[PDB]
Amino acid sequence: ATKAVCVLKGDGPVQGIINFEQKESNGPVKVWGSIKGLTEGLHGFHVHEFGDNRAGCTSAGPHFNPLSRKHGGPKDEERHVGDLGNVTADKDGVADVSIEDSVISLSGDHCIIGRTLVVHEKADDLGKGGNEESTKTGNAGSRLACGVIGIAQ
């Protein structure tokens, strides 16, 4: 079964480790791990297009949107491949991520190996945020921590 990992780092306190497992190449991907350094609440959680961190998290480019669709939440039909919603940080800044998704893959055209997982400033509004920006990125703000999704043992 195909396995991947991401180590999230950025410029301040935000850090963590996000595992990915996909036992069948057409089943869902299990995403799990933990993030610390976070303000309490909901934090946008997106696969970005490039595994490029050469000038920081900015280098990662836009959401991974191969089907040129509009931004949604995970559960929507209309959503980018890399729209994985929000993760929620507790009062002590810790987010226990647990997610199952059937739009991302670890193989094929929807493959997220070598792309970037990014944790954002604020809530992804999930297309339901009442302005232009909402239906493009979900207004989730600055990129706090990222890293490239890599092949794991």
Next chain:
Amino acid sequence: ATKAVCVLKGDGPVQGIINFEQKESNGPVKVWGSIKGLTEGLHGFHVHEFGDNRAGCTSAGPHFNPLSRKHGGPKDEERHVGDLGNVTADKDGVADVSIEDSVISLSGDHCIIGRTLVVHEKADDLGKGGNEESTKTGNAGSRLACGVIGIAQ
């Protein structure tokens, strides 16, 4: 025409950006960038199996060697997929990289997207160092800096 990038970081001063380019599937991967923070001289430049950075450059694991060959130099027929030889740091610690390789690839069985590049402590002796370890790892020492090979624009 496919592109990748690796940003090299470690616990020391060694930093670098390395670019990969393979304009067609069967063709050679062009590799180039710069690494600073190195001691003058030669340093092993290897692709390792895992894009895992969980516990630093150690988590990358072993040389990327899908064909189960002995360690050599890039020009050798007998070599690991990940055997890219050595880069040369000048007196100011700067290593200008320019490499063309036909064994690594950006797609396929020999695909290196999502794996790690590591730059090592000491010269790779290229399997001609004349001891056991020569033909496993080439004696290149500790891992100074690594980064996961990600998709680039």
